[PDB]
Nucleic acid binder design. Structure first.
Ligand SMILES: [Mg+2]
Length: 156
RNA sequence: AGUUUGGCUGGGGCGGCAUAUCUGUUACACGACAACGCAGGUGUCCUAAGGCGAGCUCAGUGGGAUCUCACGUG
């Protein structure tokens, strides 16, 4: 329809919940740094439980492609959400292709990807904030269709 | 040897503090109003838990793998 209703990926959030503070977190923070080439931040309950980072842009697309390759380009139907975003997780960072050093060990991570159109600034700008609108909101069926068009594969 | 050995009090004593004080109610829509009336507090604590600028939004609920989106008059 309109040349302004295309669905694009907004951001990619990678989370690693080791559940501990110390050297394990230090290795995880480095591992995320090599993966996305961008400084991560630590999330605490205080306790310093987990580390995470958010990636948006082309490097988000490339990282999404690598994770989908591990997941064999297939996802379950209930992995999606009515908001318009989905996600998954991989268990081994070595299976991502990253070289193995017998010091860091093997870690997993959770991938979340948020989709949306180009009008989402209205709900986030400081001045004259408003709501998006029912038509412009991305539904689950549109999200699943978008995943079928590019990076095809789904199972109900 | 000299002197003292509290008060209030449905007698006095034992008990309690109604002995200096703060909130709601008794209290009768200005103000004031008693009982050993009712439900509870006070003798402390804080170089920040004081002063100001900026940024942000809480309790909770729902959909997804601590992270993410939406709702959310308190
Ligand atoms: Mg007397």
């Amino acid at each position: 329809a309109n040349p302004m209703r295309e669905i694009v990926v907004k951001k990619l959030c990678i989370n690693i919940c080791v559940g501990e503070s110390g050297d394990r977190l230090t290795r995880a923070s480095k591992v995320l740094e090599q993966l996305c080439e961008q400084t991560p931040v630590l999330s605490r309950a205080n306790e310093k439980i987990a580390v995470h980072c958010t990636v948006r842009g082309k490097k988000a697309e490339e990282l999404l492609e690598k994770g989908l390759k591990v997941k064999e380009f297939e996802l379950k139907s209930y992995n999606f959400s009515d908001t318009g975003s989905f996600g998954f997780g991989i268990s081994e960072h070595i299976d991502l292709g990253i070289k193995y050093d017998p010091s860091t060990g093997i870690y997993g991570m959770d991938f979340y990807v948020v989709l949306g159109r180009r009008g989402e600034r209205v709900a986030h700008r400081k001045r004259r904030v408003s709501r998006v609108g029912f038509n412009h909101r991305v539904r689950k069926e549109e999200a699943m269709k978008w995943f079928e068009k590019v990076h095809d594969g789904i199972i109900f």
